[PDB]
Design a protein around this ligand. Structure first.
Ligand SMILES: CC(=O)N[C@@H]1[C@@H](O)[C@H](O)[C@@H](CO)O[C@H]1O
Ligand SMILES: CC(=O)N[C@@H]1[C@@H](O)[C@H](O)[C@@H](CO)O[C@H]1O
Ligand SMILES: CC(=O)N[C@@H]1[C@@H](O)[C@H](O)[C@@H](CO)O[C@H]1O
Ligand SMILES: CC(=O)N[C@@H]1[C@@H](O)[C@H](O)[C@@H](CO)O[C@H]1O
Ligand SMILES: CC(=O)N[C@@H]1[C@@H](O)[C@H](O)[C@@H](CO)O[C@H]1O
Ligand SMILES: CC(=O)N[C@@H]1[C@@H](O)[C@H](O)[C@@H](CO)O[C@H]1O
Ligand SMILES: CC(=O)N[C@@H]1[C@@H](O)[C@H](O)[C@@H](CO)O[C@H]1O
Ligand SMILES: CC(=O)N[C@@H]1[C@@H](O)[C@H](O)[C@@H](CO)O[C@H]1O
Ligand SMILES: *[C@H]1O[C@H](CO)[C@@H](O)[C@H](O)[C@H]1NC(C)=O
Lengths: 549, 24, 50, 99
């Protein structure tokens, strides 16, 4: 039935918690009906959207308002919440109902008088009724029943109040807060709201994230409130924690220009990184003499090395395995080698052990990723054994990314002479732990370590991120070869040298950048952050204020 | 333009990165 | 001095928040960020006291 | 999944309750809420749905008893500095104490 529009002003407030407070002003962030909002009136079953929550009110009796339905598109496929107001009680049920909402026959049967359901078994709550009548016209003439319906996470909450009002076909002023009449732990998805009039009028509004300053009197009753998003004066009250503001100028907030658009720019690289030559090399060096391969001037798709079968580990250090695809790198290396398999932990940046100390060490910072896969085949052949392991070093803690294959004599201190027995001659050991197709540590885990050096120097390896155009003269969210930031881009007209990629100011912050495709130099000017203060003549004089940026 | 004395003019002439920082 | 402290990198992998958020995941970035907040807050408190 | 709310407990461990002691300093546990202080009869009109209170800044202030639904006021155990009043020890070793 036909709509109309009005406003609330003094409604939408409810007790946000189950806590008793008195004689205080309490600031809370929750879903509330904004004080000045457009409330839609309907004549008195239209289906309305359900967003964060719904404000409902109507000066009508239970003989018309027989209940409400909340849920997703109503069907037998998903559960819906049916709230019905009976003569002496309220019955609430959740189920895959097609209908079930009749409760009164007349003529309107085309979408009614049907009772289809499934395995309800979901919070069939019953209580005293939501709607209580008055002694005819011995009250204030009609009773505006108010409800708030919330759906947060596992709970559907109902707040309400009665408080009879002076007769008017509109919403009242004054002030009243609603109480949590019902609190139901229902894991239900609600996207649509429908009334049950079985056909006056009713009002519907929507809740929004707002911070309110609530005033509790001596009896712990909310008697008033301030909506912080209503205006500069309300904002001032909320920052000062007072419903009265003295004459003067106050600092309340911070102005900020939003970027709106975004810019993504990378070097025009069409080459792909030769990861196949690393991970599918089939020829893996021993850790004793690990193979260092450099990757450059290519696009690095790392997701294919992560979202892939057969890998036993993919441990990233200093970087996320799901974000590295959006990063630019310089001088990327891939260290390829074979270890016993139970030694995987020894190639972590900070662990100890013969591998960590003598064969292959990573630096404390090590930005990079350690990737390994079982591959028992090819390497662990029966009768085979091809994996040198360095055991005796003389010194200790070789060095990060260092390699030692001199194969000398481990003087044990037994005597300063050249020999084998008692001299521990031969730094590696021939008895490689191959134990073909048996035991533990039978040489599974081919290892590739990706070392990601992150310099401000020109990117040579970039992920598979599509570039876009420039905007200029507007505050934007930009990314120039990984140089992420926000600001206004303009031509710099600066004398950059041929080898310089970007510049910095006296504070050593990025001042300008070179565009990777056009090679032009753009200045980066931070967008306005201003600062907002409010000039108040005194609330005992006027509620008019001026705003200074 | 500035209604300053000769001495005041000498005094004014002689004496000589917005990361959330501002000056009022 | 107050400005220079922004580049201190107080035990974090980077002095720049954007280079942490774009690099590490949610629970990881929080650790690096807490280090920068602690240091920057201490630097600012020192400034105000002076 | 263990959610902890100021809301009435729905699940409790296998603990044995005790009698309620009011005008004494006691170590209390109300539905998992613990603290130390004196529990006096309150005149706070808690609403039917309210379980715990708060003062102008913090602290429970008052609690509803889970069995009697009585509202109790919680006050801290008395405390204060202790100062020793003395003449010089080269005169006397008698002292007085201020609480
Ligand atoms: C909160 C809000 O949007 N209020 C506006 C109101 O200011 C305007 O006067 C009216 C149309 O006349 O439309 C309402 O939606
Ligand atoms: C007058 C009326 O509707 N009474 C209803 C009854 O129809 C319903 O079947 C029952 C729940 O099963 O709850 C009662 O309050
Ligand atoms: C149309 C219908 O009700 N289908 C239900 C299904 O939703 C439920 O999950 C299943 C028991 O697990 O029993 C079926 O009869
Ligand atoms: C400030 C205020 O409203 N105080 C009222 C008091 O006048 C009334 O007598 C009492 C109930 O008897 O309830 C208090 O909340
Ligand atoms: C870079 C490369 O070739 N990786 C291959 C992968 O595509 C394949 O799916 C897997 C066996 O399933 O073996 C890896 O070595
Ligand atoms: C040096 C340079 O990058 N020139 C770019 C070229 O790479 C790109 O392919 C083309 C658009 O297709 O626009 C040119 O300005
Ligand atoms: C000049 C003026 O308006 N004075 C009023 C005073 O009469 C009133 O009793 C008080 C209440 O808070 O508020 C002041 O602003
Ligand atoms: C350590 C010291 O100063 N002791 C003095 C003592 O020499 C003096 O004779 C006496 C007179 O009453 O007072 C004491 O406090
Ligand atoms: C409702 O929201 C949940 C959680 O976001 C989602 O999984 C479900 O598909 C949504 N259903 C509809 C009809 O929007």
């Amino acid at each position: 039935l036909p709509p109309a529009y009005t406003n609330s002003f003094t409604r939408g407030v409810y007790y946000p918690d189950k806590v008793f407070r008195s004689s205080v002003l309490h600031s809370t962030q929750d879903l509330f009906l904004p004080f000045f909002s457009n409330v839609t009136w309907f004549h008195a079953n239209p289906v309305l959207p359900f967003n964060d929550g719904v404000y409902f009110a109507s000066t009508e009796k239970s003989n018309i308002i027989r209940g409400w339905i909340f849920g997703t598109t109503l069907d037998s496929k998903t559960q819906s919440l049916l709230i019905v107001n009976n003569a002496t009680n309220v019955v609430i049920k959740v189920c895959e109902f097609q209908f079930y909402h009749k409760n009164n026959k007349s003529w309107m049967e085309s979408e009614f008088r049907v009772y289809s359901s499934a395995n309800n078994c979901t919070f069939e709550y019953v209580s005293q009724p939501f709607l209580m009548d008055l002694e005819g016209k011995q009250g204030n003439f009609k009773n505006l029943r108010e409800f708030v319906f919330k759906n947060i996470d596992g709970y559907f909450k109902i707040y309400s109040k009665h408080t009879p009002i002076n007769l008017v076909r509109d919403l009242p002023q004054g002030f009243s807060a609603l109480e949590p009449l019902v609190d139901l732990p229902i894991g239900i998805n609600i996207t649509r709201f429908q009334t049950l009039l079985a056909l006056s009028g009713y009002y519907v509004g929507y809740l929004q994230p707002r911070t309110f300053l609530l005033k509790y009197n001596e009896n712990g009753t909310i008697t008033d409130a301030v909506d912080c998003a209503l205006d500069p004066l309300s904002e001032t009250k909320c920052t000062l924690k007072s419903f009265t503001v003295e004459k003067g100028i106050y600092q309340t907030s911070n102005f900020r220009v939003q970027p709106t658009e975004s810019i993504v720019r990378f070097p025009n690289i069409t080459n792909l990184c030769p990861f196949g030559e690393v991970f599918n090399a089939t020829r893996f060096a021993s850790v004793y003499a690990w193979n260092r391969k450099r990757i450059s001037n290519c696009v690095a798709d790392y997701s294919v090395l992560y979202n892939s079968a057969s890998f036993s580990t993919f441990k990233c250090y200093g970087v996320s395995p799901t974000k590295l695809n959006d990063l630019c790198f310089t001088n990327v290396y891939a260290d390829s080698f074979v270890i016993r398999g139970d030694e995987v932990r020894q190639i972590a940046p900070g662990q100890t052990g013969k591998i960590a100390d003598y064969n292959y060490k990573l630096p404390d910072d090590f930005t990079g990723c350690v990737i390994a896969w079982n591959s028992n085949n090819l390497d662990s052949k029966v009768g085979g054994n091809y994996n040198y392991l360095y055991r005796l070093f003389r010194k200790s803690n070789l060095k990060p990314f260092e390699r030692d294959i001199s194969t000398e004599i481990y003087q044990a201190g037994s005597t300063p002479c050249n020999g084998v027995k008692g001299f521990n001659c031969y730094f590696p050991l021939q008895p490689y732990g191959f134990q073909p197709t048996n035991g533990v540590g039978y040489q599974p885990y081919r290892v590739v370590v990706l070392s990601f050096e992150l310099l401000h120097a020109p990117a040579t390896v970039c992920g598979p991120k599509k570039s876009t155009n420039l905007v200029k003269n507007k505050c934007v969210n930009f990314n120039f070869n990984g140089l992420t930031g926000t600001g206004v881009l303009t031509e710099s007209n600066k004398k950059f040298l041929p080898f310089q990629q970007f510049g910095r100011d006296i504070a050593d912050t990025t001042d300008a950048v070179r565009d990777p495709q056009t090679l032009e130099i753009l200045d980066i000017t931070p967008c306005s952050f201003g600062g907002v203060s409010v000039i108040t003549p005194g609330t005992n004089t006027s509620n008019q204020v001026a705003v200074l940026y | 333009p500035s209604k300053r004395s000769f001495i005041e003019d000498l005094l004014f002439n002689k004496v000589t990165k917005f990361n959330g920082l501002t000056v009022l | 001095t107050l400005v220079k402290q922004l580049s201190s990198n107080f035990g974090a992998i980077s002095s720049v928040l954007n280079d942490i958020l774009s690099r590490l995941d949610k629970p990881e970035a929080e650790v690096q960020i807490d280090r920068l907040i602690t240091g920057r807050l201490q630097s600012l408190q020192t400034y105000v006291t002076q």
